[PDB]
Amino acid sequence: MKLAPYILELLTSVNRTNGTADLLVPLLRELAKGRPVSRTTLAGILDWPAERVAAVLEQATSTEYDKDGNIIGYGLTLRETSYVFEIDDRRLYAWCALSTLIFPALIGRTARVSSHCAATGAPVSLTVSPSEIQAVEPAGMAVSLVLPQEAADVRQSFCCHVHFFASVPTAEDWASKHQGLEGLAIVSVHEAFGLGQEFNRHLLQTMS
Ligand SMILES: [Br-]
Ligand SMILES: [Cu+2]
């Protein structure tokens, strides 16, 4: 299907201010180590003042902090979700199915992804590298997409509707009872991975 609207709105939804893309990739790489990330650590990596880091994060209202005020969640998170995202010996989580397909390229590591079908509860899993997916189980795994909203919190307007499913027919059956959602579509996990590659390619072309 035509994916340009999804790419555009996701980029827009993500791109709220300058420096967001330049902040996003190092933050993801830090979170991937499996521990909370301090703003000062980010500042050192970026060679930014801490106030600049704070300003960018302030506009990302979905951002999760722990009791120490350190960053524990931004697309990738230490707080449990339905989407398990493992790198090496560290179990992380992701906010949505598409997230798990996009992050490995941005952090430059292969991830073991697992979840459950949103319609049947069946376990689903796959291996996601920066360049390809492997070990897709079950092989016909599907993903639901909706059109991201620009101003809304990306987590509640997009992520909460973007799931894995055991198969395309199972997902389309589920989708028939989810009317009203703007841009709701069912794609194979392969088409969703391609969507993520296009997203990443555009996102990375905007970094400093
Ligand atoms: Br289009
Ligand atoms: Cu998401």
Side-chain angles (χ1 to χ4, degrees):
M1 59 169 305
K2 304 199 82 201
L3 300 177
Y6 297 86
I7 298 166
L8 175 59
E9 296 300 304
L10 205 57
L11 273 167
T12 297
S13 305
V14 149
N15 215 236
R16 319 204 154 224
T17 80
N18 205 76
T20 299
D22 290 291
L23 176 82
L24 174 61
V25 175
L27 178 52
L28 287 172
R29 291 176 185 252
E30 283 302 302
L31 286 164
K33 295 173 185 179
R35 288 177 286 99
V37 182
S38 70
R39 294 186 172 197
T40 50
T41 289
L42 278 186
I45 296 173
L46 290 173
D47 190 22
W48 289 3
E51 281 77 11
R52 174 92 186 278
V53 170
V56 178
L57 289 176
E58 184 182 353
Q59 301 301 327
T61 58
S62 287
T63 307
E64 297 168 292
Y65 298 87
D66 65 12
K67 66 176 186 65
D68 301 324
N70 287 324
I71 302 150
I72 61 165
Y74 193 123
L76 193 63
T77 178
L78 309 179
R79 195 165 286 158
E80 180 174 350
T81 73
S82 299
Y83 310 95
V84 183
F85 187 96
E86 304 183 71
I87 304 282
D88 301 317
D89 57 331
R90 296 285 169 146
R91 176 178 311 171
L92 314 196
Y93 301 90
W95 287 355
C96 73
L98 185 57
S99 290
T100 69
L101 303 186
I102 283 166
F103 298 146
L106 297 181
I107 63 184
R109 293 296 304 270
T110 291
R112 288 180 326 266
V113 175
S114 58
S115 189
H116 294 85
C117 171
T120 65
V124 297
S125 65
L126 70 161
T127 299
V128 187
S129 93
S131 59
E132 66 188 81
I133 59 178
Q134 300 175 233
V136 185
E137 303 186 344
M141 189 184 305
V143 177
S144 58
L145 303 170
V146 299
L147 208 57
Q149 270 150 35
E150 299 178 8
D153 171 281
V154 66
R155 192 170 192 185
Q156 210 78 359
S157 71
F158 180 84
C159 300
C160 69
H161 309 300
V162 174
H163 315 274
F164 288 114
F165 296 84
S167 76
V168 166
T170 293
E172 293 181 339
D173 194 19
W174 169 95
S176 72
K177 306 308 171 183
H178 289 76
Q179 309 295 317
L181 300 175
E182 179 168 0
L184 179 60
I186 298 302
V187 299
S188 74
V189 69
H190 296 279
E191 180 162 15
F193 183 73
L195 169 61
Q197 289 184 295
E198 285 291 323
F199 170 81
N200 281 337
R201 180 171 57 81
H202 283 94
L203 177 66
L204 294 171
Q205 285 173 320
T206 74
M207 286 180 67
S208 292

